Paper text:
Here we use deep network hallucination to generate a wide range of symmetric protein homo-oligomers given only a specification of the number of protomers and the protomer length. Starting from only a choice of chain length L and oligomer valency N (2 for a dimer, 3 for a trimer, etc.), the method carries out a Monte Carlo search in sequence space starting from a random sequence. The loss function guiding the search is computed by inputting N copies of the sequence into the AlphaFold2 (AF2) network, and combining structure prediction confidence metrics (pLDDT; per-residue structural accuracy, and pTM; an estimate of the TM-score) with a measure of cyclic symmetry (the standard deviation of the distances between the center of mass of adjacent protomers within the predicted structure). To eliminate such over-fitting, we generated new sequences for the HAL backbones using the recently developed ProteinMPNN sequence design neural network (accompanying manuscript: Dauparas et al.).
To evaluate design accuracy we attempted crystallization of 19 designs and succeeded in solving crystal structures for seven (three C2s, two C3s and two C4s). All crystal structures had the correct oligomerization state and closely matched the design models (median Cα RMSD of 0.6 Å across all designs, with resolutions ranging from 1.8 to 3.4 Å). The side chain conformations in the crystal structures also closely match those of the design models. HALC2_062 is a three-layer homo-dimer with a single helix from each protomer packed together between two outer β-sheets (one from each protomer), while HALC2_065 is also a mixed α/β homo-dimer, but has a single, continuous β-sheet shared between both chains, which wraps around two perpendicular paired helices. These two hallucinated structures are distinct from any structure in the PDB, with TM-scores to their best matches of 0.59 and 0.54 respectively.
Residue numbers in the entry:
A (entry chain A), B (entry chain A): 9 to 68
The structure:
């Protein structure tokens, strides 16, 4: 269970999304990476989750 | 269902891992990003999956 601090905000389309943490779950047997993303902000969307998906990778 | 071409190889610790594709599944209702990673190469590990996890984010 890999944990990454983000501490970055995204104000996309008027939605405040202050990022908190990214909990990465890597499973080498199914070739799958699962990413839990905690944020303290307004309603999140699929476009915003890809942004925090970019940020989590840039921090490791 | 987002699909990203990778076409990059990783020879970490003597394991050839030629990357093929990354199938991203974003779920805004559980704050989870699921990543399927197809590769044509030797045995993959958790360290190698994080590398293709970095590459998939860098391509979008």
């Amino acid at each position: 269970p890999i944990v990454i601090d983000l501490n970055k905000t995204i104000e996309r389309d008027g939605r405040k999304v202050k990022l908190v943490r990214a909990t990465i779950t890597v499973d080498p047997e199914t070739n799958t990476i699962t990413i839990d993303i905690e944020y303290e902000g307004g309603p999140i969307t699929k476009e915003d989750l890809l942004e925090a998906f970019k940020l989590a990778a840039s921090k490791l």
